Enzyme design. Structure first.
Site, PDB file in Angstrom:
ATOM      1  CG  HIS A 194      31.263  20.089  24.564  1.00 41.58           C
ATOM      2  ND1 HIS A 194      30.170  21.019  25.114  1.00 41.58           N
ATOM      3  CD2 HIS A 194      31.672  20.728  23.615  1.00 41.58           C
ATOM      4  CE1 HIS A 194      30.240  22.110  24.191  1.00 41.58           C
ATOM      5  NE2 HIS A 194      31.158  21.671  23.193  1.00 41.58           N
ATOM      6  CB  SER A 234      47.477   2.804  46.884  1.00 39.97           C
ATOM      7  OG  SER A 234      46.232   2.580  47.698  1.00 39.97           O
TER       8      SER A 234
END
Ligand code: NA
Ligand code: NA
Ligand code: NA
Ligand code: NA
Ligand code: NA
Ligand code: NA
Ligand code: NA
Ligand code: NA
Lengths: 469, 469, 469, 469
Positions: D184, D308
């Site tokens: 989870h 980037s």
């Protein structure tokens, strides 16, 4: 000398409960979708068919050129209206019993209604005008239109509003809480938690607007769309006008060009829009699951609750996960209906009848998801200490504003110089400050860059949040 | 001084019946899927979890190195076995009541079982060994494996057998009935009705074989797959062997490499195979709908039944259409599960829990379709008069064998000559015979070609049917 | 003493042609999609990125508060404009060569542009303002918006118009040609061929209108949506206004709330609408294939053409079939993009980059289908003799108007009486007339019913066609 | 007096290159899929059709009962074999030119071959036996079977092997590196990096085995599956045996029951299996993207490369993201083919022809993804310092083994006591040790628990990795 036999028995045993239902939409989550039982169940469908049939007869009565159906007295109008309003599960059971003979559900409704009015001589007198000139799909398509309109206005959009408002409320609560952004999963230019919520709210509002704009269509025009039977019996009545009046009198928008069926394109439009909104909510559920994994949010715990069968420490984002799984299922059903319903062979085939019994199913999964997301949201607690501590270990994100300021002021190769300093390298506040100090920039700019921190490098985030809505 | 409150009430009202169910799998078609209620419902799941938990404790008792769980007396073994065998809806309601506190279904089963054995001092003595070292998914994955194995063996394959046998039976009944074939929807080289059925049966048998071959997998190995908790408490026990023994003792095939969850690839394999078979049946349903449209089959009618609300004459293939629509829905659900279940974040996320509650849903739609196809098949009556009359108006289909015989015997440009004679042109038996007569072929070949008719130009169709199976 | 090496070579061999392409969108059907090569190919994308980058610099130059980028002289404006207008495959090859170093396509565009302006000292002077403050996705999302807007206006909607007009033209041509309708594939209440075309045209026009209404969105706002870098360098400029101006100056609608990416919901809206229209065309292609199978339409044949490798007689609806298959593929791609693109992890993940390279693919399949449907339509010839002859063998369809007239005039059990006469029974004109003769109806009504024929029982079909548009 | 015209020109312009291709499978990624151009392109298909046609003629020649096609001399055999082996793009262009007349691709192959053998009087003599008794689909289905078999053996499985081996190699490299597991998304019982890799490898090997087991089927039996034309010309030849021999002589498994088409179920089986493997790889790509986000892996950087356009510091998992996106697209295409191909109207419709031109497309996307995952894997560097430091801040994960040891030794309410200590609470090593110290456990057990650390609480992980394969 035929003797009593029971091939026609319609027996509802005691077998079905939420515990023994095959679908969790009626089983485990039966309580979350109780609104849909009055709309999309066989009872709900029968109830709308009865309404449409009664309304059709009433329009024939009120039309001056249909002389064979005299205008109804108040008494008669009231008895018909009560058939509709007080329609019961016993009534539905009568219709099901009749279907055991007819093997045809709408003709069973017709026979059920002929039985219902048998004792009122004024209604019994016009008994053969029940379903007059109609085809089953005249009754069905209008029932489905009323079902979808009801679902949209009473169930779907109110939940969408709660989610939009809830997420907008997270945007406000967290407007100014800085977040280390992640692109490709990697530390990037900071934002605020609130601004990340604002983006989602903005997307959801676009779909809300679009769902309201989708036309909900209906038709009434006989076996294959051309009023053939109507004109055969009443050639002097303007059935094209009668149709438009009737459909619009039900609050449905008129579709004048059809085969035996309404073509279902509007259902694909409604469902494509629900699916887009559900996809936005999947994105949100996954992102929040991720913020919880990163410890940016903690979740409130409840006394007595158990996080894991074996791992006592666990507090899990189970509500977001339940939502995410049900939105997947919702979309899968909605997409199937949207792709399949509008294809029907020639003037129609019957594959759409059984498929349209599932309108509430796709919608059911979505409602279950909406409630879960809402539950999970009510448990969120932002972890400011963690958010800030992470920002304070990610000084490399100031490479962007440093290189951009350098570009403004004519320093050679700014991007390349910062790539050299930071790409694949650990640089802290002192490292970033010493780099700034060595730059040929005006002092006020150097001072501005030395005063920035990852936590304040948030651009226009706060004002964006303030401007939302 | 806390006073009684009812936040924990688990109340099943009287609201749910087949009439008010949102899903038609529990509603309109609830009676067709009654077998699945004991398997895939919340009751069915709880019942299998209880079985697995009881079996786990029993293996701990029977293992000689786990000294703290002494071997059970006959008395104790019987009490545990009865918990499993006599598991009731009231028991399920107890578990649901507990879940209102735990918000965790498997821990509720654990607490339910600790309550159940509280009065038997021998079982109460080993009460903290219920769920020992287990993670919820150890219990769940084995439950789902048992559910799928049960569904396959008791429900799915028996229906597949009825369909295969039913279609094989149509092949036999109609083995020698000539059919004007259609390719691109156009008159083509004849076959027989029986041979067209044989093809479908042959395809279905391939999938039947494949469904039997799919592995049904299960695991048991603790929170993240590595027996951590087991080894912490009992380092000297060979848990890897214990796991394999336990899983195989349940009749499930062992999956030794897992995270917290069994990865669900075998579910995708089972469902990909059901979906292929369903696709073969969609093809069959559509083709038969088409043969009925062409009047090659008539359908038997039943006293009292209604074909159309308005068109008294109608006898429609409604059973094939119901089947076709439900197989679409089945496949859409099955495909979603197959694509989604095997992706789970890191050592697992909880999206698979709510999705796996829908195993019976995809299977439900398919079962409803299988029964419908079976009903529609029992109503088929071949229209030999129509089939033969159509063949007798399509003498152009003899262009193929004429041109092929011409090729054998060295006539120039045979295809081109027959294209000239027949393409876009009406040619009858006399026209075809006069063409044959003018050909430079050996007399015996001319005689063979003059003796052919569309109805006997069927190649090896009958023998193919005879050789099937 | 490094020596020349060729790791950076970008070599386009002679290997690729339409014959050796893996995708038939560039292979077999390459000629049908030539319009898309200027839009959705890598060349097309590079060309739009170059346009956006040049336009960004030009806006910085024209903005009075950005003093470091002086307003451009006419000379300079023209050189930049020519970079955009005369962008070549050699230019694209330069960018690809640079990418062999950068492994980053937008930074390659930036370096390509810095190389391009190196010789003009006025442009070279502001060289570090190329891509100023921008993130790659600022450039990309605007490129994709321009690509989709171009595709919609120049390619998609013009084809939709040709199809709508073509089908409307079939409605006119065939307005008054009676058709035995089919529901569930069975003989039903007649219509006209033209009215069946009218229904489809009406559906298509709804989607045409909706596609025009879909918003095409774009954004420009830096790495994560908040103008961080812009404000760092130019805190006194209103970047929020600058953004809106820039996007709208490109003719794109502004999306002010984004992460690093534009969220792609508008792409799902555009594609959901294309998919609905394609589904309407699948329905049409299948129905026409069916009318051809029934011999209601013949298809024109062309000299030299071959219908079948073996069956000389064959004339097949191959154009409708090609269309039907490609629309399936189109929808599958469009649905995947619509479902997947709007989910991106946190402030974005890069899965959308490779997926968005496929925008033209989904659109390509659809264009190929549109052209095929158009070809198949140009070959249709209605078979009036067959249509009328079929109607003349289906007198049972007059059971509906007879029973409806009986209902009007108070005859007992009209539907039931006609069901008895016709359901599962052959009744011809004489049989229907003798039944009418025995009815207790006013003579003028009996005369009207005796004057009807299946071919004139067409209700309002012709007037409906006349009222279309 | 007809004059030369150019309606038949087949002109391949210079328009198509990888830069201008609409599909990135031939465009941006054209170099990654070069193996498929010889298989799935129009050239590849034509080449296999030519092979099948030549082989068919050769079997007719070698069969003793087909007296009209005499056995070929060595010379003749060699000329036919060279047609196949030396089949060129010019040859393909000849076939395309012929198709401009025939509008039928297989008849064009037939005419191309009749032209090819025209100059060899021994082959020209049996020219009308080219394509003898065959239907186009006899040639096509065998071509597709050969294409898929080639793709499987030469392209697909070798890549699957590289991925399995590569991931198994990560399992070995990282066998003993502890990992804080996440369920989870939350801190859970530790594993090792290597064990997490082992799970994936194990899943992939199951599919590898299954892909090898899928039958690749082929048929040869005339227009509608019954050898009609064969038997018309040669009633004394056992065509059923001839068929089986021919298909198996090509190395394909025989499908004896077909319509005009091979039904394509085996294609759905092959593609369902590729899709399962691709889904396993999506799971892996997403998990690794996640481990990179958590800083458990760093990625190696390359000189000159740009992370980037704006953020100089970025090193992104771009190869895993490219893979993830292409596997989505692969599955969408594969699923469409698997669902659609096996449904064909009656004895077939032509929708499958255009769809089957896309076999290489679905496979293309997958190959592009496989190469990307392989690239991304070669860049992984485990961050042991981060992994260990995280473990050292997550002492609460020892709640599980403490409570399980407590269960073994009869301490009351062990789970409940640890839930109280740890759920929603921060507990460090000293806190955990003080809790252990206060427990009524045997000293040796207390000593064992005090000696555990999150980093050594790894159960059987290392031995599991060692036992893999
Ligand atoms: Na009236
Ligand atoms: Na239709
Ligand atoms: Na024991
Ligand atoms: Na995983
Ligand atoms: Na300026
Ligand atoms: Na997101
Ligand atoms: Na021979
Ligand atoms: Na078929």
């Amino acid at each position: 000398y035929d003797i009593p036999t029971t091939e026609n028995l319609y027996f509802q045993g005691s077998e079905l409960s939420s515990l023994t239902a095959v679908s969790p939409v009626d089983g485990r989550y039966g309580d979350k979708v109780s609104a849909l039982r009055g709309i999309f169940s066989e009872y709900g469908l029968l109830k709308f068919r009865v309404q449409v049939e009664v309304r059709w007869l009433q329009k024939l009565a009120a039309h001056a050129a249909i002389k064979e159906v005299p205008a109804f007295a108040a008494d008669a109008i009231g008895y018909l209206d009560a058939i509709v309003a007080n329609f019961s599960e016993e009534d539905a059971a009568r219709i099901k019993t009749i279907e055991r003979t007819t093997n045809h559900d709408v003709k069973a409704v017709e026979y059920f209604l002929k039985e219902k009015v048998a004792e009122i001589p004024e209604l019994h007198a016009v008994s053969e005008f029940i379903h007059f000139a109609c085809t089953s799909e005249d009754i069905n398509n209008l029932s489905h239109a009323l079902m979808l309109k009801t679902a949209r206005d009473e169930v779907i959009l109110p939940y969408w509003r709660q989610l939009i408002d809830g997420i907008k409320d997270l945007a406000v609560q967290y407007r100014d809480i800085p977040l280390l952004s992640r692109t490709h999963g990697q530390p990037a230019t900071p934002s605020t938690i609130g601004k990340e919520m604002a983006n989602v709210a903005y997307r959801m509002e676009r779909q809300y607007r679009q769902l309201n704009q989708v036309e909900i269509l209906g038709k009434i025009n006989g076996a294959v769309g051309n009023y053939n039977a109507h004109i055969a019996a009443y050639p002097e009545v303007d059935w094209h006008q009668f149709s438009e009046e009737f459909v619009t009198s039900l609050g449905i928008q008129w579709n004048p060009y059809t085969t035996q069926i309404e073509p279902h394109d509007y259902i694909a439009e409604l469902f494509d829009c629900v699916a887009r909104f559900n996809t936005i909510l999947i994105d949100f559920d996954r992102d929040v699951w991720g913020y919880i994994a990163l410890n940016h949010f903690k979740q409130k715990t409840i006394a007595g609750e158990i996080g894991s069968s074996t791992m006592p420490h666990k507090v899990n984002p189970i509500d977001f996960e339940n939502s995410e799984g049900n939105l997947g299922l919702s979309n899968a059903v909605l997409q199937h209906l949207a792709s399949k319903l509008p294809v029907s062979r020639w003037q129609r085939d019957l594959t759409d009848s059984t498929v349209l019994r599932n309108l509430g199913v796709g919608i059911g999964y979505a409602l279950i998801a909406y409630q879960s997301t809402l539950k999970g949201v009510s448990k969120l607690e932002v972890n400011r200490d963690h958010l800030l501590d992470e920002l304070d270990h990610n000084w490399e994100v100031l490479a962007e504003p440093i290189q951009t300021v350098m570009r403004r002021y004519g320093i050679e190769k700014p991007y390349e110089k910062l790539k050299e300093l930071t790409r694949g390298k650990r640089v802290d506040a002192e490292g970033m400050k010493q780099f700034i100090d060595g730059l040929a920039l005006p002092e006020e700019e150097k001072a501005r860059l030395k005063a920035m921190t990852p936590a304040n490098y948030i651009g226009r985030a706060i004002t964006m949040v303030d401007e939302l809505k």
